[PDB]
Design an enzyme around this catalytic site. Structure first.
Site, short mmCIF file in Angstrom:
data_model
loop_
_atom_site.label_atom_id
_atom_site.label_comp_id
_atom_site.label_asym_id
_atom_site.label_seq_id
_atom_site.Cartn_x
_atom_site.Cartn_y
_atom_site.Cartn_z
N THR A 180 0.80 -1.23 0.00
CA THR A 180 0.00 0.00 0.00
C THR A 180 0.82 1.27 0.00
O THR A 180 1.81 1.39 0.74
CB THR A 180 -1.01 0.13 1.17
N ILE B 299 -4.09 5.50 -6.86
CA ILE B 299 -5.02 6.44 -6.28
C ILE B 299 -5.75 5.75 -5.14
O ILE B 299 -6.00 4.56 -5.23
CB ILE B 299 -6.01 6.95 -7.36
N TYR C 197 -10.10 14.87 -3.40
CA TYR C 197 -9.48 14.35 -4.61
C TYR C 197 -8.85 15.45 -5.45
O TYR C 197 -7.71 15.34 -5.88
CB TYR C 197 -10.55 13.58 -5.42
N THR D 82 -12.93 2.72 -16.98
CA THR D 82 -12.56 1.72 -15.96
C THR D 82 -13.76 1.44 -15.09
O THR D 82 -14.66 2.25 -15.00
CB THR D 82 -11.38 2.19 -15.08
N1 LIG Z 1 -10.74 6.38 -14.88
C1 LIG Z 1 -10.99 7.68 -14.93
O1 LIG Z 1 -12.17 8.21 -15.47
C2 LIG Z 1 -9.97 8.63 -14.42
C3 LIG Z 1 -10.15 9.98 -14.63
C4 LIG Z 1 -9.15 10.86 -14.29
C5 LIG Z 1 -7.97 10.37 -13.76
N2 LIG Z 1 -7.84 9.03 -13.54
C6 LIG Z 1 -6.58 8.60 -12.96
O2 LIG Z 1 -6.02 7.49 -13.59
C7 LIG Z 1 -5.34 6.74 -12.61
C8 LIG Z 1 -5.92 5.33 -12.58
O3 LIG Z 1 -7.34 5.43 -12.61
P1 LIG Z 1 -8.23 4.09 -12.79
O4 LIG Z 1 -9.62 4.45 -13.18
O5 LIG Z 1 -7.38 3.13 -13.54
O6 LIG Z 1 -8.31 3.57 -11.27
P2 LIG Z 1 -8.60 2.07 -10.77
O7 LIG Z 1 -9.06 1.19 -11.85
O8 LIG Z 1 -9.50 2.21 -9.61
O9 LIG Z 1 -7.18 1.53 -10.27
C9 LIG Z 1 -6.52 2.10 -9.16
C10 LIG Z 1 -5.23 1.31 -8.91
O10 LIG Z 1 -4.56 1.80 -7.76
C11 LIG Z 1 -4.40 0.75 -6.81
N3 LIG Z 1 -4.51 1.23 -5.41
C12 LIG Z 1 -5.64 1.64 -4.75
N4 LIG Z 1 -5.34 1.98 -3.47
C13 LIG Z 1 -4.02 1.78 -3.30
C14 LIG Z 1 -3.20 1.98 -2.20
N5 LIG Z 1 -3.69 2.43 -1.04
N6 LIG Z 1 -1.87 1.69 -2.34
C15 LIG Z 1 -1.36 1.22 -3.54
N7 LIG Z 1 -2.17 1.03 -4.63
C16 LIG Z 1 -3.48 1.32 -4.51
C17 LIG Z 1 -5.48 -0.29 -7.18
O11 LIG Z 1 -5.14 -1.60 -6.82
P3 LIG Z 1 -5.41 -2.27 -5.38
O12 LIG Z 1 -6.82 -1.96 -4.99
O13 LIG Z 1 -5.22 -3.77 -5.53
O14 LIG Z 1 -4.38 -1.73 -4.40
C18 LIG Z 1 -5.48 -0.18 -8.68
O15 LIG Z 1 -4.45 -1.01 -9.23
C19 LIG Z 1 -5.51 7.47 -11.29
O16 LIG Z 1 -4.39 8.31 -11.06
C20 LIG Z 1 -6.78 8.24 -11.51
O17 LIG Z 1 -6.90 9.42 -10.78
C21 LIG Z 1 -8.80 8.14 -13.89
C1 LIG Z 2 -16.73 16.04 -15.95
C2 LIG Z 2 -16.48 14.54 -16.21
C3 LIG Z 2 -17.83 13.89 -16.61
C4 LIG Z 2 -15.54 14.30 -17.40
O1 LIG Z 2 -16.01 15.08 -18.49
C5 LIG Z 2 -15.55 14.74 -19.83
O2 LIG Z 2 -14.74 13.84 -20.06
C6 LIG Z 2 -16.17 15.60 -20.90
C7 LIG Z 2 -17.43 16.26 -20.31
C8 LIG Z 2 -18.55 15.25 -20.08
O3 LIG Z 2 -18.34 14.00 -20.17
O4 LIG Z 2 -19.68 15.73 -19.81
C9 LIG Z 2 -14.10 14.66 -17.11
C10 LIG Z 2 -13.57 13.86 -15.93
C11 LIG Z 2 -14.44 13.98 -14.67
C12 LIG Z 2 -14.15 15.36 -14.04
C13 LIG Z 2 -14.03 12.82 -13.71
C14 LIG Z 2 -12.59 12.88 -13.25
O5 LIG Z 2 -11.79 13.70 -13.70
C15 LIG Z 2 -12.16 11.93 -12.19
C16 LIG Z 2 -13.02 11.14 -11.55
C17 LIG Z 2 -12.44 10.23 -10.49
C18 LIG Z 2 -12.02 8.89 -11.16
C19 LIG Z 2 -11.45 7.85 -10.18
C20 LIG Z 2 -11.16 6.54 -10.90
C21 LIG Z 2 -10.09 8.28 -9.65
O6 LIG Z 2 -9.41 9.05 -10.35
O7 LIG Z 2 -9.65 7.81 -8.56
C22 LIG Z 2 -12.49 7.61 -9.07
C23 LIG Z 2 -12.92 8.89 -8.35
C24 LIG Z 2 -13.37 10.03 -9.29
C25 LIG Z 2 -13.34 11.29 -8.40
C26 LIG Z 2 -14.79 9.67 -9.79
C27 LIG Z 2 -15.42 10.71 -10.73
C28 LIG Z 2 -14.52 11.12 -11.93
C29 LIG Z 2 -14.68 9.96 -12.96
C30 LIG Z 2 -14.95 12.51 -12.50
C31 LIG Z 2 -14.78 13.54 -11.38
C32 LIG Z 2 -16.44 12.54 -12.92
C33 LIG Z 2 -16.83 13.74 -13.78
C34 LIG Z 2 -15.92 13.74 -15.03
CL LIG Z 3 -10.97 -1.68 -15.11
#
Ligand SMILES: NC(=O)c1ccc[n+]([C@@H]2O[C@H](COP(=O)([O-])OP(=O)(O)OC[C@H]3O[C@@H](n4cnc5c(N)ncnc54)[C@H](OP(=O)(O)O)[C@@H]3O)[C@@H](O)[C@H]2O)c1
Ligand SMILES: CC1(C)[C@@H](OC(=O)CCC(=O)O)CC[C@]2(C)[C@H]3C(=O)C=C4[C@@H]5C[C@@](C)(C(=O)O)CC[C@]5(C)CC[C@@]4(C)[C@]3(C)CC[C@@H]12
Ligand SMILES: [Cl-]
Ligand SMILES: NC(=O)c1ccc[n+]([C@@H]2O[C@H](COP(=O)([O-])OP(=O)(O)OC[C@H]3O[C@@H](n4cnc5c(N)ncnc54)[C@H](OP(=O)(O)O)[C@@H]3O)[C@@H](O)[C@H]2O)c1
Ligand SMILES: CC1(C)[C@@H](OC(=O)CCC(=O)O)CC[C@]2(C)[C@H]3C(=O)C=C4[C@@H]5C[C@@](C)(C(=O)O)CC[C@]5(C)CC[C@@]4(C)[C@]3(C)CC[C@@H]12
Ligand SMILES: [Cl-]
Lengths: 243, 251
Positions: free
Chosen positions: A67, A96, A158, A195
């Site tokens: 972790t 994250i 966040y 995801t």
């Molecule tokens: N998906 C989106 O729409 C989105 C949008 C903006 C940014 N992001 C960014 O993209 C990156 C990955 O997103 P994602 O959607 O792929 O997330 P995800 O599918 O939820 O994966 C998160 C990863 O981090 C690991 N993790 C969680 N807690 C942890 C801890 N305490 N210590 C070490 N590892 C930990 C998880 O594995 P374990 O649970 O096994 O530890 C998993 O491998 C993040 O930086 C996120 O902010 C995603």
């Molecule tokens: C505005 C829209 C919809 C998107 O908007 C667009 O792409 C175009 C506009 C539209 O779609 O209307 C841009 C990204 C975003 C701002 C998006 C983001 O940035 C990061 C996360 C995080 C992802 C994740 C996995 C984490 O990062 O840990 C888990 C927690 C968390 C906070 C969940 C919610 C979303 C998914 C979050 C805030 C939802 C709203 C979202």
């Molecule tokens: Cl996934």
């Protein structure tokens, strides 16, 4: 112009790589012939990614589970990864802490843990990785969010942590520039990526089509390989953030 | 804006022993506010309190303590509340000592900057919000151009000020929809002629520092008028909204 051979025989760490974007990234690196060291908390799932990476043709592939709350694990992890690979060319900071849509009231605990996992651990990993990255003229990839550039409700803690990343890493990028340190820093601003975690989170809101995690992962890798300061995915964000 | 807007209002000012916080304390005093000031040093705070009274504060007290201690932060707001019988405005201005240096491996400093410059602000806000809700009050958050724009030598500082933007800009949006009538003002300041800052930029090339007294006032006006952001000095917006977008869109 990117080409896959750029990653061939490269020694990459990918964090938060048991699932989502992280695992796609590892699989891409494997297909390209990099070495990979993956981490997350979950052993069995990391082993799944490792064996598939080998199948896809990773030069080598190992996991180390732990972790990123534990800063001691962070430091140690890097030391031990670079050892497995005998070096380090690219550090991908992607992990994250678990976060859901909630209004802010009094959860200081969540605020401190977000900052610890999403931001502080990235600094510790960077500090540990820096000696190896310096010698390989390597690259740092920091994964952020549109909500790390623009603030959104229901994700205050966040956003604070992702903003903090922009604050810190862009600053040290100007420092590495003036101090003649040949180590690149790529900040990735992602929109909604499909995801499971993100899709579970947004089931309740109106949003546009989530972008495919496979392609997202690819564009991150490309950006870091090419040493771009910032990557926007999906691409149509680039126009948002600069207008 | 009119000074009368601050008369009889109950205001907290943190980091008010010197620099911009002290000037805000004095301005609020001249306006006839109730003030409670805080910082680590009681002797310096007592001097501020004395002069506030002479400037004509409805009332003035200090409470001394460090904002590394989240327990002090939370109990401070409560004592300040009971002392004034309430709270109209919370001015979060304090900052941990920082000097310009290349980041190498000072994780203590990154963590301490984050505890003092960001987390304490959140603890303060949580503690204060009930009183602020009753008064439809205001939170003022003092940030920095380096909390919007990338500079070398200020990595930990910048991360902490950026974190403030992220957090408070997010809850502002929540409060608008939930219909919570507490304004949140984020101040982006350029170089201000406080002793701390002038000692830091000593021997560096720079535009004339802006006066700390005028800075303090523009901060108070912005918060009193419920503005989302304040930029001081006035020249700052050209960098923020013109120069920076271009540099970005060029690279
Ligand atoms: N998906 C989106 O729409 C989105 C949008 C903006 C940014 N992001 C960014 O993209 C990156 C990955 O997103 P994602 O959607 O792929 O997330 P995800 O599918 O939820 O994966 C998160 C990863 O981090 C690991 N993790 C969680 N807690 C942890 C801890 N305490 N210590 C070490 N590892 C930990 C998880 O594995 P374990 O649970 O096994 O530890 C998993 O491998 C993040 O930086 C996120 O902010 C995603
Ligand atoms: C505005 C829209 C919809 C998107 O908007 C667009 O792409 C175009 C506009 C539209 O779609 O209307 C841009 C990204 C975003 C701002 C998006 C983001 O940035 C990061 C996360 C995080 C992802 C994740 C996995 C984490 O990062 O840990 C888990 C927690 C968390 C906070 C969940 C919610 C979303 C998914 C979050 C805030 C939802 C709203 C979202
Ligand atoms: Cl996934
Ligand atoms: N001056 C500038 O050019 C400039 C530019 C941009 C932004 N700002 C922002 O403006 C604000 C005030 O700046 P300034 O120049 O007026 O700073 P300053 O003169 O150094 O004053 C800092 C204040 O914070 C207090 N403080 C320091 N550590 C503390 C701690 N652990 N706990 C509680 N209080 C503490 C100090 O009092 P004690 O030491 O007695 O505790 C003092 O009252 C800060 O938020 C800063 O980031 C300033
Ligand atoms: C670019 C210029 C010259 C300035 O240029 C214009 O004015 C236009 C805009 C503000 C600024 C970016 C400025 C800033 O923002 C915040 C601080 C901090 C003030 C203070 C008191 C603190 O905030 O704790 C102590 C620590 C610290 C880092 C000292 C250095 C300065 C003064 C810092 C970075 C010096 C460079 C400065
Ligand atoms: Cl001063």
């Amino acid at each position: 112009e990117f080409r896959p051979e750029m990653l061939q025989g490269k020694k990459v760490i990918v964090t938060g790589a048991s699932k989502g974007i992280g695992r796609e990234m590892a699989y891409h690196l494997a297909k390209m012939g990099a070495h990979v060291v993956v981490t997350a908390r979950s052993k069995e799932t990391l082993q799944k990614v490792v064996s598939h990476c080998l199948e896809l043709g990773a030069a080598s592939a190992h996991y180390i589970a732990g972790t990123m709350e534990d800063m001691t694990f962070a430091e140690q992890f890097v030391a031990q990864a670079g050892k497995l690979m005998g070096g380090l060319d690219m550090l991908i900071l992607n992990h994250i802490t678990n976060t859901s849509l909630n209004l802010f009231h009094d959860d200081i605990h969540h605020v401190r843990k977000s900052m610890e996992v999403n931001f502080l651990s990235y600094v510790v990993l960077t500090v540990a990785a820096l000696p190896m990255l310096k010698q390989s003229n390597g690259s740092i990839v920091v994964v952020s969010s549109l909500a790390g550039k623009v603030a959104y409700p229901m994700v205050a803690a966040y956003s604070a942590s992702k903003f903090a990343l922009d604050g810190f890493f862009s600053s040290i990028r100007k420092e590495y520039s003036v101090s003649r340190v040949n180590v690149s820093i790529t900040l990735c601003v992602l929109g909604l990526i499909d995801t499971e975690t993100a899709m579970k989170a947004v089931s309740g809101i109106v949003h546009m089509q989530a972008a495919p995690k496979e392609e997202c992962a690819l564009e991150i890798i490309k950006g870091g390989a090419l040493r771009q300061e910032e990557v926007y995915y999906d691409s149509s964000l680039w126009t948002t953030l600069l207008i």
